[PDB]
Amino acid sequence: DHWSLRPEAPPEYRICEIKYSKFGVDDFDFGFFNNTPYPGLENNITNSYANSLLQVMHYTPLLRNMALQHAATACLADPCLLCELGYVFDMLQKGEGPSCHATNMLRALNHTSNASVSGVLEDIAKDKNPSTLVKNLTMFLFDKISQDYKGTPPISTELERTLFKLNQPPNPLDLVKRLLETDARYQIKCMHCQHVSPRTATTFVNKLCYPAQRITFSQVLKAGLENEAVNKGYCTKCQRYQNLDQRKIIFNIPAVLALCTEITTAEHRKLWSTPGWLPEEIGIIVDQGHVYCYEGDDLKLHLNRHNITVYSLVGTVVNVETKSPQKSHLVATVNVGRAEPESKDQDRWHLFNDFSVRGISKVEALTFNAAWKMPVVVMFQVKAANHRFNMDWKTRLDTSVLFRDNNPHALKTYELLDRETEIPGPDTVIAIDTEFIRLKISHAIARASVVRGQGSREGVAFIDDYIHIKETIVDYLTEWSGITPTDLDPINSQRNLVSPKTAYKKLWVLVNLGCKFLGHGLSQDFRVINIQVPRNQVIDTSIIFMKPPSQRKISLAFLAWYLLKEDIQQNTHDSIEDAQTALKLYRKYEEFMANGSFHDVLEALYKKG
Ligand SMILES: [Zn+2]
Ligand SMILES: [Zn+2]
């Protein structure tokens, strides 16, 4: 009937391999694995286990908004996982192609504090099981982005204010706590003199708890949130060690409810394999330090009769086992309808097996198999937050990073944008080109040049950032890029050497400002830059000068030689020059189209080898 009923993982659930060539990743047919408007994530990256989690979080409206409202600020923190989260979320909502990738964000994770000791790095972590890794990451991320959010005031808290029906705008500290934390504390009572003493409790992600017939998910959730225990400890009142009654007094439940299944035994898998065991909708009651959860018709009855906060199931991080050779990898089954305008079709579940995306039924999404298909992380959010969004992060996007000057050297190869006269917009055209280096084939941006495409200073660069790469560079590609170790050396560089996220922030802002990116073969640049740019914001000269059927692209050097009569390969490649070259080529294209000679020129371009 459906895939999850099979004794083994069907090809739709198996690991998807990327096949490589000399051309590289770009020639690989990602479109074969995804025919949906919902892009997947590529899995040829270190710590790519995060893909399933990133997907589930992205289609959680409160989480996506949270990240975007922060990323749109003037935050120059690097590494900063919340900013990186905003970038990835932005790519997943902008992406017109079949696949995206979170290279920059997984690289930044590797540099994040306490990452090497939180078991979130598959090369360092003790337990290298993907299910364990994504459990730790879920806890690690929720903790990190919570303090990242309060670091600098977000662009807008208007969504949350409306959601929580507040009158005055809430402050970040109280807000992020209501969104992610389970407000609670431990009441430690001496069982002799009945003396009570409090112990603070911090909880971002909760863990399910199982007993040991008719065991429900609501009961397992309730058992997980609460915590009653008895341990011997000293009592200050009666001056001796007594039995202490310790109960977790619960005050508030988070707007975003992340849950770890903690499946360890065979009995746990038998329980989860029960058809219809996982409800897509739950209601939780917090009364006098206790938590009461309801589901199904039992939930409907209580609602007809109180403090019942209805939660909607967003998605599930699922562990998929393969019998031979024995292993495991993660996929994501998500209802993408939660983050979309409300329609009649509420059931919009999709399978996110890395870059392989497929639509599935509610049954399949809520069906689990004790042999190979088991849930790891379950994501709920308040139903009132469904189909909600806020565009103030884009409307009031902070652009200070474009105008700020922190370059010590007086000799620059760029002239920054004037804050008054040169404010980028939808009509603004910019020419861009980058330079690559080799990492321990893995490429990385070593230099990014953006050039004015119009105005009196047309051709003059306003961005020429060199990247302080915190990785090990195998090859500088000096013949190909003209990049020397001195240019990237923080002590001896004469360049505007900046952090990776600092330079990325500029480009990310320019995209959301609506700017049109002009260049030659920009698809390779954007991939290594790790960004997604809409088609109507891309002016590519390699695409422009194609004769329609051939699909073969002309070199930048040949176009410059034939249309501009220039030799641009004399010295080593310079990203500013190559950007100016592409801009010149586009201006020639405008001339050819205007006088109606473009057809003849295009024909002339294709005559010999
Ligand atoms: Zn940030
Ligand atoms: Zn006592």
Coordinates of C-alpha atoms and ligand atoms in Angstrom, one line a residue:
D1 CA 0.0 0.0 0.0
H2 CA 2.8 2.4 1.0
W3 CA 6.6 2.3 1.3
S4 CA 6.8 2.1 5.1
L5 CA 5.1 -1.3 5.1
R6 CA 8.1 -2.9 3.3
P7 CA 10.4 -5.1 5.3
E8 CA 13.4 -3.1 4.1
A9 CA 13.9 0.6 3.1
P10 CA 12.7 1.2 -0.4
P11 CA 15.0 3.2 -2.8
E12 CA 13.0 6.3 -1.9
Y13 CA 14.3 6.0 1.6
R14 CA 17.9 4.8 0.8
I15 CA 21.0 6.9 0.8
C16 CA 21.3 9.0 -2.3
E17 CA 24.8 9.2 -3.8
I18 CA 26.2 12.1 -5.8
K19 CA 28.3 11.0 -8.8
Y20 CA 31.2 13.2 -9.8
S21 CA 33.0 14.2 -13.0
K22 CA 35.7 16.6 -14.2
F23 CA 32.9 19.2 -14.7
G24 CA 31.9 18.5 -11.1
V25 CA 28.7 18.7 -9.1
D26 CA 27.0 21.1 -11.5
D27 CA 26.5 18.5 -14.3
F28 CA 24.9 16.0 -11.9
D29 CA 21.2 15.7 -12.5
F30 CA 19.6 16.8 -9.2
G31 CA 16.4 17.5 -11.0
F32 CA 15.9 13.8 -11.4
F33 CA 15.5 13.3 -7.7
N34 CA 13.1 16.3 -7.1
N35 CA 10.1 17.4 -9.1
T36 CA 8.6 19.5 -6.3
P37 CA 8.9 23.3 -5.5
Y38 CA 10.5 22.2 -2.2
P39 CA 14.3 21.9 -2.6
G40 CA 16.3 19.3 -0.7
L41 CA 19.8 19.4 0.8
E42 CA 23.0 17.8 -0.7
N43 CA 24.7 15.1 1.4
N44 CA 28.3 15.3 0.3
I45 CA 29.3 17.6 3.2
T46 CA 30.8 16.9 6.6
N47 CA 28.0 16.7 9.3
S48 CA 25.4 16.5 6.5
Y49 CA 23.3 14.5 9.0
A50 CA 21.9 17.9 10.0
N51 CA 19.9 18.1 6.7
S52 CA 16.8 16.4 8.1
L53 CA 16.8 18.6 11.2
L54 CA 17.3 21.8 9.1
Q55 CA 14.3 20.8 6.9
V56 CA 12.0 20.2 9.9
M57 CA 13.1 23.5 11.6
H58 CA 12.7 25.4 8.3
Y59 CA 9.0 24.5 7.9
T60 CA 8.4 25.4 11.6
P61 CA 7.1 29.0 11.1
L62 CA 8.2 30.2 14.5
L63 CA 11.7 28.9 14.0
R64 CA 12.1 30.3 10.4
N65 CA 10.8 33.7 11.4
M66 CA 13.1 33.7 14.5
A67 CA 16.2 33.1 12.4
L68 CA 15.3 35.6 9.7
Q69 CA 14.5 38.4 12.2
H70 CA 18.0 38.0 13.6
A71 CA 19.9 37.4 10.4
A72 CA 18.5 40.6 9.0
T73 CA 20.1 42.6 11.8
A74 CA 23.6 44.2 11.9
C75 CA 25.0 41.1 13.6
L76 CA 28.6 40.6 12.7
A77 CA 29.2 37.6 15.0
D78 CA 31.1 34.8 13.4
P79 CA 30.6 32.0 13.9
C80 CA 26.9 32.6 14.6
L81 CA 24.6 29.6 14.0
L82 CA 21.4 31.6 14.1
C83 CA 22.6 33.8 11.3
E84 CA 23.7 30.8 9.4
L85 CA 20.2 29.3 10.1
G86 CA 18.6 32.4 8.5
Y87 CA 20.8 32.0 5.4
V88 CA 19.9 28.3 5.0
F89 CA 16.2 29.0 5.6
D90 CA 16.4 31.9 3.1
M91 CA 17.9 29.5 0.5
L92 CA 15.1 27.0 1.0
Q93 CA 12.4 29.6 0.4
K94 CA 14.2 31.4 -2.4
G95 CA 15.6 28.3 -4.1
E96 CA 14.1 27.7 -7.6
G97 CA 16.3 24.7 -8.2
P98 CA 15.9 21.1 -7.0
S99 CA 18.6 21.2 -4.3
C100 CA 20.4 23.4 -1.9
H101 CA 23.3 22.8 0.5
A102 CA 24.3 24.1 3.9
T103 CA 28.1 24.1 3.6
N104 CA 28.8 27.4 5.3
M105 CA 26.5 26.6 8.2
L106 CA 28.1 23.1 8.9
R107 CA 31.5 24.7 8.6
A108 CA 30.6 27.4 11.1
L109 CA 29.2 24.7 13.4
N110 CA 32.7 23.2 13.4
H111 CA 34.1 26.5 14.8
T112 CA 31.3 27.0 17.3
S113 CA 32.2 26.9 21.0
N114 CA 31.6 23.6 22.8
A115 CA 30.8 21.9 19.5
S116 CA 33.8 19.5 19.9
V117 CA 32.4 18.4 23.3
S118 CA 28.7 18.3 22.6
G119 CA 28.8 15.4 20.2
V120 CA 27.6 17.3 17.2
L121 CA 30.7 16.7 15.0
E122 CA 30.7 13.3 13.3
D123 CA 34.5 13.3 13.2
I124 CA 35.1 14.1 16.9
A125 CA 31.9 12.9 18.6
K126 CA 31.9 9.8 20.8
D127 CA 28.7 8.3 19.4
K128 CA 28.9 8.6 15.6
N129 CA 25.4 7.3 15.0
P130 CA 23.4 9.9 13.0
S131 CA 20.4 9.5 15.3
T132 CA 22.6 10.4 18.3
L133 CA 24.3 13.2 16.4
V134 CA 21.0 14.8 15.5
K135 CA 19.8 14.5 19.0
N136 CA 22.8 16.4 20.3
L137 CA 22.6 18.9 17.5
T138 CA 18.9 19.6 18.3
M139 CA 19.8 20.4 21.9
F140 CA 23.0 22.2 20.8
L141 CA 21.2 24.4 18.2
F142 CA 18.3 25.3 20.4
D143 CA 20.7 26.4 23.1
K144 CA 23.0 28.4 20.8
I145 CA 20.3 30.2 18.8
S146 CA 18.6 31.1 22.1
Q147 CA 21.6 33.2 23.2
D148 CA 22.3 34.3 19.7
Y149 CA 18.8 35.7 19.5
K150 CA 19.2 37.9 22.6
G151 CA 22.7 39.1 21.5
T152 CA 21.2 41.8 19.4
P153 CA 17.7 43.2 19.1
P154 CA 15.8 41.4 16.3
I155 CA 14.2 43.4 13.4
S156 CA 10.7 42.6 14.5
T157 CA 8.9 40.8 17.3
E158 CA 5.5 41.7 15.8
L159 CA 4.6 38.2 14.9
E160 CA 5.2 36.9 18.4
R161 CA 3.4 39.9 20.0
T162 CA 0.3 39.2 17.9
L163 CA 0.6 35.5 18.5
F164 CA 0.9 35.8 22.3
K165 CA -1.7 38.6 22.2
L166 CA 0.6 41.0 24.0
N167 CA -0.1 44.8 24.0
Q168 CA 3.4 46.2 24.3
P169 CA 6.3 44.7 22.3
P170 CA 8.1 42.0 24.3
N171 CA 11.8 42.0 25.0
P172 CA 14.0 39.3 23.4
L173 CA 15.0 37.6 26.7
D174 CA 11.4 36.9 27.7
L175 CA 10.3 36.1 24.1
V176 CA 13.0 33.5 23.2
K177 CA 12.3 31.8 26.6
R178 CA 8.6 31.5 25.8
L179 CA 9.4 30.2 22.4
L180 CA 12.0 27.4 23.1
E181 CA 12.1 26.9 26.9
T182 CA 10.0 24.8 29.2
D183 CA 9.7 27.2 32.2
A184 CA 10.1 25.0 35.2
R185 CA 12.0 24.4 38.5
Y186 CA 12.6 21.5 40.9
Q187 CA 10.9 21.4 44.3
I188 CA 13.1 19.5 46.7
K189 CA 11.2 18.5 49.9
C190 CA 12.6 16.8 52.9
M191 CA 10.4 13.8 53.7
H192 CA 11.0 14.3 57.4
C193 CA 10.6 17.9 58.4
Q194 CA 8.7 18.8 55.2
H195 CA 11.1 21.6 54.4
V196 CA 11.2 22.7 50.7
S197 CA 14.1 24.2 48.7
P198 CA 14.1 25.1 45.0
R199 CA 16.5 24.1 42.3
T200 CA 16.5 25.9 38.9
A201 CA 15.9 23.9 35.7
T202 CA 16.7 24.8 32.1
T203 CA 15.1 22.8 29.3
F204 CA 15.3 23.6 25.6
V205 CA 14.6 20.1 24.2
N206 CA 12.5 17.5 26.1
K207 CA 13.0 13.7 26.1
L208 CA 10.2 11.1 25.8
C209 CA 9.8 8.5 28.6
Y210 CA 8.4 5.0 28.4
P211 CA 6.9 2.7 31.2
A212 CA 7.8 -0.9 32.1
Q213 CA -1.2 -2.0 26.9
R214 CA -3.0 1.0 25.4
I215 CA 0.0 3.2 25.9
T216 CA -0.6 6.6 24.2
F217 CA 1.8 9.3 22.9
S218 CA 0.1 11.8 25.2
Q219 CA 1.1 9.6 28.2
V220 CA 4.7 9.3 27.0
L221 CA 4.9 13.0 26.4
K222 CA 3.5 13.7 29.9
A223 CA 6.0 11.3 31.5
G224 CA 8.8 13.0 29.7
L225 CA 8.0 16.5 30.7
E226 CA 7.5 15.7 34.3
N227 CA 10.0 14.3 36.8
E228 CA 9.3 12.8 40.2
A229 CA 12.1 11.1 42.1
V230 CA 13.4 10.2 45.6
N231 CA 17.0 10.4 46.6
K232 CA 19.0 10.6 49.8
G233 CA 20.4 14.1 50.5
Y234 CA 21.3 16.5 53.3
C235 CA 18.7 18.7 54.8
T236 CA 19.8 22.0 56.3
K237 CA 16.8 22.2 58.7
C238 CA 16.9 18.9 60.5
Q239 CA 20.7 18.9 60.1
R240 CA 21.0 15.4 58.6
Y241 CA 20.7 13.3 55.4
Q242 CA 17.1 12.4 54.6
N243 CA 15.0 11.0 51.8
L244 CA 14.3 14.0 49.5
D245 CA 11.1 14.3 47.4
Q246 CA 12.1 16.1 44.2
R247 CA 9.4 17.0 41.7
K248 CA 9.8 19.1 38.5
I249 CA 7.3 21.9 38.9
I250 CA 6.3 23.0 35.4
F251 CA 5.1 26.6 34.8
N252 CA 5.1 27.0 31.0
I253 CA 5.5 25.0 27.9
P254 CA 7.4 26.4 24.9
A255 CA 5.7 27.6 21.7
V256 CA 8.0 25.3 19.8
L257 CA 8.0 21.8 21.2
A258 CA 11.0 19.8 20.2
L259 CA 11.0 16.2 21.4
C260 CA 13.6 13.4 21.5
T261 CA 12.1 9.9 21.2
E262 CA 14.9 8.2 23.1
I263 CA 14.1 4.8 21.5
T264 CA 16.5 2.3 23.0
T265 CA 14.8 -1.1 23.4
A266 CA 13.0 -3.5 21.1
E267 CA 9.8 -2.8 23.1
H268 CA 10.1 0.9 22.3
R269 CA 10.2 0.0 18.5
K270 CA 7.1 -2.3 18.8
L271 CA 5.3 0.6 20.5
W272 CA 6.2 3.2 17.8
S273 CA 5.3 0.7 15.1
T274 CA 1.7 0.8 16.2
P275 CA -0.4 2.3 13.3
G276 CA -1.7 5.8 14.1
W277 CA 0.2 6.1 17.4
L278 CA 1.7 9.5 16.6
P279 CA -1.0 12.1 16.5
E280 CA -0.7 15.1 14.2
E281 CA -2.4 17.2 16.8
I282 CA -2.1 17.4 20.6
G283 CA -3.4 19.5 23.4
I284 CA -1.5 20.3 26.6
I285 CA -2.8 21.5 30.0
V286 CA -0.5 23.1 32.6
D287 CA -2.1 23.1 36.0
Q288 CA -0.4 23.4 39.4
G289 CA 3.0 22.2 38.2
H290 CA 1.5 19.3 36.3
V291 CA 1.1 18.6 32.6
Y292 CA -1.8 16.9 30.9
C293 CA -1.7 15.9 27.3
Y294 CA -4.6 14.8 25.1
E295 CA -5.0 13.5 21.5
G296 CA -7.7 12.2 19.1
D297 CA -11.3 12.2 20.1
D298 CA -10.2 12.6 23.7
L299 CA -8.7 16.0 22.7
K300 CA -11.9 17.0 20.9
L301 CA -14.0 16.3 24.0
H302 CA -11.9 18.4 26.3
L303 CA -11.9 21.3 23.8
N304 CA -15.7 21.2 23.8
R305 CA -15.9 21.3 27.6
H306 CA -9.7 25.4 29.9
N307 CA -5.9 25.8 29.5
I308 CA -5.6 23.7 26.3
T309 CA -2.8 24.8 24.0
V310 CA -3.3 22.9 20.8
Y311 CA 0.0 21.9 19.1
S312 CA 0.4 20.9 15.5
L313 CA 2.9 18.3 14.2
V314 CA 5.3 20.0 11.9
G315 CA 7.6 17.1 11.0
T316 CA 9.8 14.2 12.1
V317 CA 13.5 13.4 11.8
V318 CA 13.6 9.8 10.9
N319 CA 16.3 7.2 11.2
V320 CA 16.6 4.8 8.3
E321 CA 18.5 1.5 8.7
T322 CA 20.0 -0.6 5.9
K323 CA 20.4 -4.3 6.4
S324 CA 23.5 -4.9 4.2
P325 CA 25.9 -3.3 4.6
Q326 CA 24.6 -2.3 8.1
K327 CA 24.4 1.4 8.7
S328 CA 22.0 4.3 9.1
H329 CA 21.2 7.8 7.7
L330 CA 18.5 10.4 8.4
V331 CA 15.5 11.6 6.4
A332 CA 12.8 14.2 7.1
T333 CA 9.0 13.7 6.8
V334 CA 7.5 17.2 7.0
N335 CA 4.0 18.7 6.5
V336 CA 4.9 21.8 4.5
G337 CA 1.4 23.1 4.8
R338 CA 2.1 24.6 8.3
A339 CA 4.4 27.3 6.8
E340 CA 2.0 28.0 3.9
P341 CA -1.3 30.0 3.6
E342 CA -4.2 28.0 4.9
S343 CA -6.0 25.9 2.2
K344 CA -8.5 23.1 2.0
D345 CA -5.6 20.6 1.5
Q346 CA -4.1 20.5 5.0
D347 CA -2.3 17.2 4.4
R348 CA 0.9 18.3 2.4
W349 CA 3.4 15.8 3.8
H350 CA 6.8 15.4 1.9
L351 CA 9.7 13.1 2.2
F352 CA 13.1 14.9 2.4
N353 CA 15.7 12.3 1.8
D354 CA 18.6 14.7 1.3
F355 CA 18.3 16.1 -2.3
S356 CA 15.6 13.5 -3.1
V357 CA 12.2 15.1 -2.4
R358 CA 8.9 13.4 -2.8
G359 CA 5.3 14.0 -1.8
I360 CA 3.7 11.4 0.5
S361 CA 0.4 10.7 2.3
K362 CA -0.3 11.4 5.9
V363 CA -0.4 7.7 6.6
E364 CA 3.0 7.1 5.2
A365 CA 4.4 10.1 7.1
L366 CA 2.9 8.7 10.3
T367 CA 3.8 5.1 9.6
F368 CA 6.9 3.6 11.2
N369 CA 8.6 0.2 10.9
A370 CA 10.4 -1.6 13.7
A371 CA 12.8 -3.1 11.2
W372 CA 14.3 0.1 9.7
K373 CA 12.1 3.2 10.1
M374 CA 12.1 4.9 13.5
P375 CA 11.5 8.5 14.6
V376 CA 14.4 10.4 16.4
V377 CA 13.2 14.0 16.7
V378 CA 9.6 15.1 16.7
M379 CA 8.6 18.7 16.2
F380 CA 5.5 20.4 17.4
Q381 CA 4.5 24.1 17.4
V382 CA 1.4 25.9 18.6
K383 CA -1.5 25.6 16.1
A384 CA -2.1 29.4 16.4
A385 CA 1.3 30.0 14.8
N386 CA 0.4 28.0 11.7
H387 CA 0.3 29.8 8.4
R388 CA 1.9 32.8 10.1
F389 CA 4.8 34.9 8.8
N390 CA 6.4 38.4 9.1
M391 CA 8.2 40.2 6.3
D392 CA 9.6 43.1 8.4
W393 CA 13.0 41.4 8.4
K394 CA 13.1 42.0 4.7
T395 CA 11.2 45.3 4.7
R396 CA 13.5 46.9 7.4
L397 CA 16.6 44.9 6.5
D398 CA 19.8 46.4 8.1
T399 CA 22.3 47.5 5.5
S400 CA 25.0 48.9 7.7
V401 CA 27.4 46.2 6.7
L402 CA 27.6 47.6 3.1
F403 CA 28.8 51.0 4.3
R404 CA 31.0 50.2 7.2
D405 CA 34.8 50.7 6.9
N406 CA 37.1 48.6 9.1
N407 CA 40.1 48.5 6.7
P408 CA 43.3 49.7 8.4
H409 CA 45.2 50.2 5.1
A410 CA 44.8 53.5 3.3
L411 CA 45.5 51.9 -0.1
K412 CA 42.3 50.2 -1.3
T413 CA 41.2 48.6 -4.6
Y414 CA 37.6 49.5 -3.9
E415 CA 35.4 52.6 -3.1
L416 CA 32.6 51.9 -0.6
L417 CA 29.0 52.8 -1.3
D418 CA 27.9 56.3 -0.3
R419 CA 25.4 55.9 2.5
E420 CA 23.3 58.8 1.1
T421 CA 23.5 58.5 -2.7
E422 CA 24.3 54.9 -3.4
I423 CA 21.6 52.8 -1.6
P424 CA 21.1 49.5 -3.5
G425 CA 17.6 48.6 -4.7
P426 CA 15.6 46.4 -7.2
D427 CA 16.8 48.6 -10.1
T428 CA 20.5 48.5 -9.0
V429 CA 22.7 46.3 -11.2
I430 CA 26.0 45.0 -9.7
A431 CA 28.8 43.1 -11.4
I432 CA 30.3 40.2 -9.3
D433 CA 33.1 37.7 -9.6
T434 CA 35.0 35.5 -7.1
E435 CA 38.3 33.6 -6.7
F436 CA 38.6 30.0 -5.4
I437 CA 41.1 28.0 -3.4
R438 CA 41.4 24.3 -2.6
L439 CA 40.6 22.8 0.8
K440 CA 41.3 19.5 2.5
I441 CA 37.6 18.7 -4.7
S442 CA 36.4 21.2 -2.1
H443 CA 36.5 24.9 -3.0
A444 CA 36.1 28.0 -0.9
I445 CA 35.8 31.7 -1.6
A446 CA 39.1 33.5 -1.1
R447 CA 38.1 36.8 -2.7
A448 CA 34.8 38.4 -3.6
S449 CA 34.6 41.4 -5.9
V450 CA 31.4 43.4 -6.5
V451 CA 31.4 46.2 -8.9
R452 CA 29.0 49.2 -9.7
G453 CA 27.0 48.4 -12.8
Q454 CA 25.7 51.9 -13.4
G455 CA 26.2 55.6 -12.5
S456 CA 29.1 57.9 -12.8
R457 CA 31.4 55.4 -11.1
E458 CA 30.3 52.5 -13.3
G459 CA 33.0 49.9 -13.2
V460 CA 34.3 51.0 -9.8
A461 CA 34.3 48.2 -7.2
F462 CA 32.6 48.9 -3.8
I463 CA 33.4 45.4 -2.5
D464 CA 36.7 43.6 -2.7
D465 CA 36.9 41.4 0.3
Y466 CA 39.6 38.7 0.9
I467 CA 38.5 35.9 3.2
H468 CA 40.3 35.0 6.4
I469 CA 39.8 31.2 5.9
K470 CA 39.9 29.2 9.2
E471 CA 40.4 26.0 7.2
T472 CA 43.5 24.2 6.0
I473 CA 44.3 25.4 2.4
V474 CA 45.7 22.6 0.2
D475 CA 46.1 24.8 -2.9
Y476 CA 46.0 28.5 -3.3
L477 CA 45.6 28.2 -7.1
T478 CA 47.9 31.2 -7.7
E479 CA 48.1 30.7 -11.4
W480 CA 44.3 30.4 -11.7
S481 CA 43.3 33.1 -9.2
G482 CA 46.4 35.2 -8.5
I483 CA 45.9 34.6 -4.7
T484 CA 49.0 34.5 -2.5
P485 CA 49.2 33.3 1.1
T486 CA 50.1 36.9 2.1
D487 CA 46.7 38.1 0.9
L488 CA 45.0 35.8 3.3
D489 CA 47.5 36.2 6.1
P490 CA 46.0 38.4 8.8
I491 CA 49.4 39.8 9.8
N492 CA 50.9 40.7 6.5
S493 CA 47.8 41.2 4.2
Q494 CA 47.4 44.5 2.4
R495 CA 43.8 43.6 1.6
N496 CA 40.5 44.1 3.3
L497 CA 40.7 40.7 4.9
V498 CA 37.5 39.8 6.6
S499 CA 35.7 36.8 8.1
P500 CA 33.7 34.5 5.8
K501 CA 30.3 35.5 7.3
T502 CA 31.2 39.2 7.1
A503 CA 31.6 39.0 3.4
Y504 CA 28.7 36.7 2.9
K505 CA 26.5 39.1 4.9
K506 CA 27.1 41.8 2.3
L507 CA 26.1 39.6 -0.6
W508 CA 23.1 38.2 1.3
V509 CA 21.8 41.8 2.0
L510 CA 22.3 42.7 -1.7
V511 CA 20.2 39.8 -2.7
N512 CA 17.3 40.7 -0.4
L513 CA 17.6 44.3 -1.5
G514 CA 16.5 43.1 -4.9
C515 CA 19.8 43.8 -6.7
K516 CA 20.6 42.2 -10.1
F517 CA 23.8 40.2 -10.1
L518 CA 25.8 40.5 -13.3
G519 CA 28.6 38.1 -14.2
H520 CA 29.9 35.2 -16.3
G521 CA 28.9 31.6 -15.3
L522 CA 27.6 32.8 -11.9
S523 CA 26.2 29.3 -11.1
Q524 CA 29.6 28.1 -10.0
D525 CA 30.2 31.3 -8.0
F526 CA 26.9 31.1 -6.1
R527 CA 27.4 27.5 -5.3
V528 CA 30.8 28.0 -3.6
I529 CA 29.5 31.3 -2.1
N530 CA 26.6 29.0 -0.9
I531 CA 23.7 31.3 -1.8
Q532 CA 20.5 31.2 -3.9
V533 CA 19.7 34.1 -6.2
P534 CA 16.3 34.3 -8.1
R535 CA 16.5 34.1 -11.9
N536 CA 15.2 37.6 -12.4
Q537 CA 18.1 38.9 -10.3
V538 CA 20.7 37.1 -12.4
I539 CA 22.3 38.6 -15.5
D540 CA 24.6 35.9 -16.8
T541 CA 26.7 36.7 -19.9
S542 CA 27.5 33.0 -20.4
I543 CA 23.8 32.4 -20.8
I544 CA 23.1 35.5 -22.9
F545 CA 25.6 34.6 -25.6
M546 CA 24.3 31.1 -26.3
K547 CA 22.9 29.9 -29.6
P548 CA 19.6 28.3 -28.3
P549 CA 19.9 24.6 -29.3
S550 CA 23.6 24.0 -28.6
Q551 CA 23.5 24.7 -24.8
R552 CA 27.3 25.3 -25.0
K553 CA 28.7 28.3 -23.2
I554 CA 31.4 30.6 -24.6
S555 CA 34.4 31.5 -22.5
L556 CA 34.8 34.9 -20.9
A557 CA 38.1 35.4 -22.6
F558 CA 36.8 34.6 -26.1
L559 CA 33.8 36.9 -25.7
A560 CA 36.2 39.7 -24.5
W561 CA 38.5 39.0 -27.4
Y562 CA 35.9 38.9 -30.1
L563 CA 33.5 41.6 -28.9
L564 CA 35.8 43.9 -27.1
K565 CA 39.1 43.1 -28.9
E566 CA 40.8 42.6 -25.5
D567 CA 43.3 40.0 -24.1
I568 CA 42.2 39.4 -20.5
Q569 CA 44.5 36.5 -19.9
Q570 CA 47.7 38.4 -19.9
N571 CA 48.1 38.7 -16.2
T572 CA 46.8 36.3 -13.6
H573 CA 43.0 36.5 -13.1
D574 CA 41.6 39.4 -11.1
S575 CA 38.0 39.3 -9.9
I576 CA 37.5 43.0 -10.3
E577 CA 38.7 43.0 -13.9
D578 CA 36.6 39.9 -14.8
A579 CA 33.6 41.6 -13.3
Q580 CA 34.2 44.7 -15.4
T581 CA 34.7 42.5 -18.4
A582 CA 31.3 40.9 -18.0
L583 CA 29.7 44.3 -17.5
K584 CA 31.3 45.5 -20.7
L585 CA 30.1 42.4 -22.5
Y586 CA 26.5 43.0 -21.3
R587 CA 26.7 46.7 -22.5
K588 CA 27.7 45.4 -25.9
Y589 CA 24.7 43.0 -25.8
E590 CA 22.4 46.0 -25.1
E591 CA 23.9 47.8 -28.2
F592 CA 23.5 44.7 -30.4
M593 CA 19.8 44.2 -29.3
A594 CA 19.0 47.9 -29.8
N595 CA 20.4 48.2 -33.4
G596 CA 19.1 44.7 -34.3
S597 CA 22.6 43.3 -35.1
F598 CA 22.6 40.7 -32.2
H599 CA 21.4 37.8 -34.4
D600 CA 24.2 38.4 -36.9
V601 CA 26.8 38.6 -34.1
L602 CA 25.5 35.5 -32.4
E603 CA 25.8 33.6 -35.7
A604 CA 29.3 34.9 -36.2
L605 CA 30.3 33.6 -32.7
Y606 CA 29.4 30.1 -33.8
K607 CA 31.3 29.4 -37.0
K608 CA 34.5 27.7 -36.0
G609 CA 35.9 25.8 -33.1
Ligands
ZN1 ZN 23.9 36.5 14.3
ZN2 ZN 14.6 18.0 56.9

